[PDB]
Amino acid sequence: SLSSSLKTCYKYLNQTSRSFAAVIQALDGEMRNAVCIFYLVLRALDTLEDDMTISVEKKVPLLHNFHSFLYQPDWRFMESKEKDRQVLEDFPTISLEFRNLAEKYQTVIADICRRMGIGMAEFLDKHVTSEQEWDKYCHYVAGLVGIGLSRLFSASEFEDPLVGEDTERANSMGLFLQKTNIIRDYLEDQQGGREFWPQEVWSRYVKKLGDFAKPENIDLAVQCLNELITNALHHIPDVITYLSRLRNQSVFNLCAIPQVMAIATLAACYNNQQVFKGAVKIRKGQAVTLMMDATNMPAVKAIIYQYMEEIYHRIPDSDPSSSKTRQIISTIRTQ
Ligand SMILES: CC(C)=CCC/C(C)=C/CC/C(C)=C/[C@@H]1[C@@H](COP(=O)(O)OP(=O)(O)O)[C@]1(C)CC/C=C(\C)CCC=C(C)C
């Protein structure tokens, strides 16, 4: 029943997505293929953005015109050294199945691809300075994914136009997972020469971001860690609002599960010295387990509050963000 090229696409999905493979495949009807392809295209775009062997000069055009390659049946890329390179090397298969989608899905995917590429290109020439610039970077690489996902949910008509139209809530959905991964991946990123923590934040603690890796700076490092976590917690009211509107079970599970996995990650990272020594880059099993039964808003809220409580009771009174952290948590609780 499934074509060869589509089986391959779902193959690539399972190979490359630790976080989304199962939920994508459980999607109802015409959403499944559309979101699968959306994933694969963005994975290909990211595989380009992240490859450091590709010079800025060559990368810029690639990121700018990546959206147009979807409509070039022959287009592939063979120069990648990245682990996920096969999506670029077999891009024609992916772009084939992309062109097999209804126009309404293609237009969304292409638009998000164009916008993301322009954004990723813009950050090749700069660091993340301010918190606003942090939000801007996250918007380009993650915010727009939630915005695109939401426009696909609306286009399909399983969800109301509001889901696709409330771009702020969809953006926050994207921002929360991306801040979470950035916070969690400090060391891995430092060791690979990538820096994502906003300078205006860490510069109040140390002179170079890599200094958080020095044992003598652990206490300052954890302070900065708690400040950034606290900034990310601010997206949770919006996540609640967004998850509260979803009508379709499959869509609700797709959106809810990664948000809750991220919340468990943050709680595991709060005031945790070990962030600076490596990574819990494996889903929290307590969270996976709780989410098996959490198919509705009141169950998801209960899990959120529980994790928020876990952070709340561990806040040091001496930590300089201690007030803000308690404050956002209290807001979440009453949303
Ligand atoms: C289309 C689809 C699901 C995904 C496409 C994702 C791709 C490839 C984007 C290209 C840039 C990248 C890479 C961004 C980072 C993803 C890493 O997750 P992760 O856990 O590391 O995966 P795994 O661990 O399995 O390797 C990220 C954090 C953004 C996820 C933002 C979402 C999902 C919007 C939520 C909003 C609503 C639900 C409104």
Ligand SMILES: [Mg+2]
């Ligand atoms: Mg990237």
